[PDB]
């Protein structure tokens, strides 16, 4: 027959991750 063929190419990079968490709460407002 012959030697085994070359390995296939690496798979595709995985899907992008999900959107990150929402940022932290802003500081409370100044007294009037």
């Amino acid at each position: 027959y012959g030697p085994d063929g070359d390995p296939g190419d690496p798979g595709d990079p995985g899907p992008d991750g999900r959107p990150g968490p929402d940022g932290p709460d802003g500081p409370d407002g100044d007294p009037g």
């Binding site: 030697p3 070359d6 190419d9 690496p10 999900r18 932290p24 500081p27 009037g32």
Partner: protein, 32 residues
């Protein structure tokens, strides 16, 4: 000797990415 076999199937896709970085802080609350 014989010729090498056909190239193999491409690999499976990678796993999912991590969630993104946290968002920026909210704005300051309105003044009183």
């Amino acid at each position: 000797y014989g010729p090498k076999g056909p190239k193999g199937p491409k690999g499976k896709p990678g796993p999912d990415g991590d969630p993104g970085d946290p968002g920026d802080p909210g704005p300051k609350g309105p003044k009183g």
